[PDB]
Structures are given as C-alpha cells and as structure tokens.
C-alpha cells in the first residue's frame, strides 16, 4: 500500500463533470481507496482550466497506475477533456522514460502544486528536501482557488431573465450579466436560466431571451474563471427544441416545471442525452414514460415542488422558510442556513438565488 497524489485537470466540455468522473473511475478500482480530494483551481489555458488533486492509497505499482490513468483518460474521452498525472508518491523518486515521480513539472505548475500541498501541507520534494515548497508556490504566482467544490451537493444558481428582474438603465442591460458573475464567484456549480416569471409569453419571445443570453455566455467562455453546467428552465416543448438545436453543446440539463407533451419532450431529451427533472406539480408514471422513450434513469432527477436523485428548490420560498413581507436580505438567510443543512444531508442538487 502506497499513497499517491493524482493531479486532474480539464478545460473542455462539462469541466466539473469530467473531474468528478475521473475520480469516480479511480474510486471504483478495487485496489484503490480515495483518501482526500483537494479544492478546485482555475488557471488560464482557449478556455479556463479546472484543476484539482486526489490523495489515494493503492497497491498499484507506479507503472501499473500509469496504465490505469491512460485508460481513464480514454473513458472520459480525451482543449483537453481530462489530464491525469501521478504528482507524487510519498518520498518516492523514480526516473524512467515512461515516468518520473515526482512529476517533472510539479514544481513548475501552480495548478498542480497548490492542490498537492493542500492535500499534504508537510510535503517535501524528495529530490530537494531543503526546498520549502510554500515559497515556490508563491513564486509561481497566479492561481485562483474556486468556491465551487467536489461536494456531493451541487449548488444550482438561478438566473431569471423574466420581468421580475428588471432594472435596465438608459444605456445598460448589465444586470443579468452581473448576476451570472456573482453566482459564479460565490461557487454555483450549476446555472439554471429561465425566461419567465404574470402575462404569458410566446415561444418566440421565450426563445429570444434564452438564446441571447446563451450566445452571451458562449462569448464569455474564455473569460469565466469557472464554466458552470447549464440548466435550461422552461416548460415549453418548442423552446427546448430550438434552444437544444442551437446550444446543446453547452447545456447539461432541462428543468421543466409543467408537463405537457411529456411524450415528445422525452423523445427530445433522449436524442440529446441530457439530464431531466421531475417536479410536482406519481413521479413513477412520468419516470416510466421517460424511461420508456429511451431516457436512462440516472440522467433524471425528481423535485417535490414547493409551490432517482433529488433536486430541491427552496430558495426565497416563505412557505418552507416559515412564510412574507420579509426582505431579500432575510429571505436568503433562511435559505442559506437551510442550504447549509441539506448539504449535510444527501441532497444531490439545490436551486438557490444566493449560495
Ligand atoms: Mg499527462
């Protein structure tokens, strides 16, 4: 049994998902235990890189572990989708054309070294036992530790484009953009964009608002410290159709509150292989239809619906935080404190305005 620090980076696709999946792959090996996972780090490539590290225990030999990693790199399907490197193994020093441990660039890459030292604050490079790596890390300079984590409970950030959020000024439409930014900085792992509050809205106009914002998102891809997973919040079948046709590459999930056309909707999610949610307003009958039309069960969440993995939407809802003249600075606090409790529980996804 040896301890290895595995470095995991990615700047392509669903970034945090690729990282979670490489970790899942390793944990699933009968001869590997996962000891600890580092924080998530952002560095610049062209899209932003997402890097972390994991400390494992394993009876694998370095070269055999090298073999496993290339395998995993091909499973996740490797702008690199996934890059896996043996960063270190205790005080092990190994030089072979095949591999070097510690990794030759460990001490040149802050996105490698920072997570390592986070996992092993007392670690010294065995080739250079006198090198205080804290000093080196700082010399390497640039590195953003994100508030997004590899926790079990992912936080979905609400981005409403409807009339509720309207404060546009003479020459600026910046509020929803500012809102996306705040959410991403405060650690939302996911973003749920919906364009309806009120007076009904057409398919064409619902589509227009969603499209303009996704195109805006895409134009910002290399400017985001973290590229969140994207959930599309609409109950209209034709909206899904058009939005998925244009933007399926950057969408992770469809979140539909009202069921009509559930048949054609599943047929659409299946073609696109996307996550689906089930809200109230039994879940079984729906599940079966979805399951029927070709929707893999794991790709589907349920929501009980204040108004199979578990999504809960409870943000700024009075009925569930104890009802409602209360200000936003108070509504969030009941959410934020109740969020902090669902995380503790198993909760897979929580939908919130503030993290
Ligand atoms: Mg490599």
Numbering used by the authors: 1 to 45, 56 to 88, 97 to 215, 220 to 303, 325 to 350, 374 to 389, 391 to 422
From the paper:
Here, we report the structure of the F. tularensis enzyme and show that it is fused to 6-hydroxymethyl-7,8-dihydropterin pyrophosphokinase (FtHPPK) which catalyzes the previous step in the pathway. DHPS acts at a crucial convergence point in the folate pathway, and catalyzes the condensation of p-aminobenzoic acid (pABA) and 6-hydroxymethyl-7,8–dihydropterin-pyrophosphate (DHPPP) to form the intermediate dihydropteroate. The structure reveals the molecular organization of the resulting bifunctional enzyme, and we also demonstrate that each active site binds substrate in the same manner observed in the monofunctional forms.
One of the compounds, 2-(7-amino-1-methyl-4,5-dioxo-1,4,5,6-tetrahydorpyrimido[4,5-c]pyridazin-3-yl)propanoic acid (Compound 1), is a low molecular weight fragment-like molecule that is well suited for elaboration and further development, and it was of interest to evaluate its binding within the F. tularensis enzyme. To accommodate the molecule, the Mg2+ ion is shifted nearly 4 Å, presumably to coordinate the partial negative charge associated with the nitro group. A consequence of this rotation is that the ‘nitrogen face’ does not directly engage residues 43–47 but instead interacts with loop H2 via a water molecule that occupies this void. Thus, while Compound 1 closely mimics the binding of substrate in the FtDHPS module, it only partially mimics substrate binding in the FtHPPK module. In contrast, the presence of the DHPS inhibitor in the pterin pocket of FtHPPK is very surprising and has important implications for drug discovery.
